[PDB]
Amino acid sequence: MNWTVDIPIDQLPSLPPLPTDLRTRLDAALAKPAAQQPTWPADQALAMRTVLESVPPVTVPSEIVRLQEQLAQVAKGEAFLLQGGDCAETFMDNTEPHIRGNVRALLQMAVVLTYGASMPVVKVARIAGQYAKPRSADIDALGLRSYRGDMINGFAPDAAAREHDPSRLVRAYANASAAMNLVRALTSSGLASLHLVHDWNREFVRTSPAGARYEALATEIDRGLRFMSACGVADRNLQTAEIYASHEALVLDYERAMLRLSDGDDGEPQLFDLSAHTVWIGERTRQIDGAHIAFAQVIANPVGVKLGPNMTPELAVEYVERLDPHNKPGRLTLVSRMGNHKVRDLLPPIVEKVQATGHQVIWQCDPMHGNTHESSTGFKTRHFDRIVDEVQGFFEVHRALGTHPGGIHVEITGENVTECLGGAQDISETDLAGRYETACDPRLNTQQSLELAFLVAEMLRD
């Protein structure tokens, strides 16, 4: 009568517990305060975690130690990181076409950034779990509790949908798993083929209005590829695409339910978060003595920390001390998100002081989150131009210092959406109402995210 189906969550027997020592450590760490947590009752949360402790993981430990070695390259200045995908994944759009479109977009950026940087690009999707977000107000504009992502409540704007229901924990796992399944299939398919991927770049250059501007680079990359193949490289000679899953580690009941211990064949058991390959802690949940930082300390996965305009060099050094106590290159990524009017002035002393610690972090640019604003026509938006200028400024600080602009972190879709302003298409304030589809922040659309790749490429070539 209400267009809903109820799926019973199966109550299945448990596997053995994690060992008691690591449990003792994890418990000590999660007694710390945790910001932004759902407000569901403990018994229900407890119940839902118990279901997730025995489900097949989303990732496995070997992929994560592989990601760790690729990231060390990045930290040593010999590889570049690309991380990008939906601001918020929703369950409704966790469909083959949308997932295929974001995977394409990302591989499309990747070949352009690879040519331009002249080194490997490690590809990290914001996918298979980006279902939770913070909020600054518990009351939104409609006078409702805030949407906090599909792992927590519903986007629909009513009270019943907005209550925090922990059965969304198991709904998230399911969608994460199904999405992961599909990204592994698509990355071992013809979709990954370099030759394919950059014929899209060429359809892009034909159809775009700033197309004349990018033709030269597009033709060069093309000739690059034609030269690979003329020298006898065919696609089975490359070893296949690797696209890694990441999300913000926000909801501790989910992340800790997804903890596992590794074979001990690799060598030495340890705790991995198998909800994803790498995760990051956000600007609202990175309190130095908080449950999120503590949790990142305990997990073997590479981690990242979002660093905003209020950040001090001294808080940054503490992150490095807390999150890279063994000095492992690429274990910690520090993510700059300052605004394009501020990165040139604010980032430099942060880098100087962290570089002096003797540790090797990855410096990655997030040119989105610092540069958001509301248009006169209602919608929340970002100016493409300001986004570009932030990557520009981040490259300029790294050049001036001799450190390595390690990568970017961007919110993008393969959809032809009208969320961010400007770009070649100069989406205006008027155009935002046509296809404003984000469940949260404004995403660069397919064309804009590509255009940005071209522009970051020319930056890597200087």
Nearer to a second copy, 274 or 332 (CB): 274
Nearer to a second copy, 278 or 381 (CB): 278
Report if residue 281 touches Mn ion, rule: CB under 5 A.
Answer: no
Distance CA 68, CA 74 (A): 10
Distance CA 408, CA 364 (A): 5
Report if residue 346 touches Mn ion, rule: CB under 5 A.
Answer: no
Helix pair angle (313-323, 348-356), 10° resolution = 40
Nearer to a second copy, 118 or 310 (CB): 118
Nearest Cα to Cα of residue 248 among 214, 266, 273:
273
CA dihedral 382, 77, 232, 219 (to 10 degrees): 40
449 contacts which partner out of Mn ion, a second copy, none, CB within 5 to 8 A by kind?
A: none
127 contacts which partner out of Mn ion, a second copy, none, CB within 5 to 8 A by kind?
A: none
To the question of whether residue 420 is assigned a binding role by annotation, the answer is: no
Name which of residues 419 to 448 contact Mn ion (CB under 5 A). Answer: 441
Q: What minimum distance in Å lies between the beta carbon of 239 and a second copy?
A: 5
To the question of whether residue 337 is assigned a binding role by annotation, the answer is: yes
Nearer to a second copy, 51 or 343 (CB): 51
CB contact at 8 A, 447 and 416: yes
To the question of whether residue 284 is assigned a binding role by annotation, the answer is: yes
Nearest Cα to Cα of residue 149 among 124, 125, 175, 123:
175
To the question of whether residue 369 is assigned a binding role by annotation, the answer is: yes
Nearer to a second copy, 117 or 354 (CB): 117
DSSP structural state of residue 439? S
Q: What minimum distance in Å lies between the beta carbon of 338 and Mn ion?
A: 15
441 contacts which partner out of a second copy, Mn ion, none, CB within 5 to 8 A by kind?
A: Mn ion
Q: What minimum distance in Å lies between the beta carbon of 276 and a second copy?
A: 13
Q: Could you tell me the two tokens for 364?
A: 């990655």
The mark string for 70-109 relative to Mn ion (x by CB under 5 A, - otherwise) is: -----------------x----------------------
Q: Could you tell me the two tokens for 145?
A: 């509790």
Q: Could you tell me the two tokens for 362?
A: 């990855």
To the question of whether residue 352 is assigned a binding role by annotation, the answer is: no
To the question of whether residue 126 is assigned a binding role by annotation, the answer is: yes
Q: What minimum distance in Å lies between the beta carbon of 396 and Mn ion?
A: 24
Residue number with the smallest Cβ distance to Mn ion: 441
Q: What minimum distance in Å lies between the beta carbon of 92 and a second copy?
A: 5
Q: What minimum distance in Å lies between the beta carbon of 248 and Mn ion?
A: 9
Nearer to a second copy, 196 or 210 (CB): 196
87 contacts which partner out of Mn ion, a second copy, none, CB within 5 to 8 A by kind?
A: Mn ion
Give whole-number Cα distances, 423 to 181, 195, 449, in Å: 33, 26, 9
Distance CA 38, CA 205 (A): 45
Distance CA 378, CA 376 (A): 6
Distance CA 142, CA 163 (A): 15
Q: What minimum distance in Å lies between the beta carbon of 444 and a second copy?
A: 23
Q: What minimum distance in Å lies between the beta carbon of 169 and a second copy?
A: 8
Report if residue 150 touches Mn ion, rule: CB under 5 A.
Answer: no
To the question of whether residue 398 is assigned a binding role by annotation, the answer is: no
Give the number of other CB atoms < 10 A from CB of residue 3.
Answer: 4
To the question of whether residue 326 is assigned a binding role by annotation, the answer is: no
Q: Which residue has the tokens 């009752």?
A: 41
Which string of DSSP letters, residue by residue, matches 224-245?
A: HHHHHHHTT--GGGS----EEE
CB contact at 8 A, 400 and 355: no
Binding residues for Mn(2+): 87, 369, 411, 441
Site of interaction with Mn ion (CB under 5 A)? 87, 441
Binding residues for phosphoenolpyruvate: 126, 283-284, 306, 337
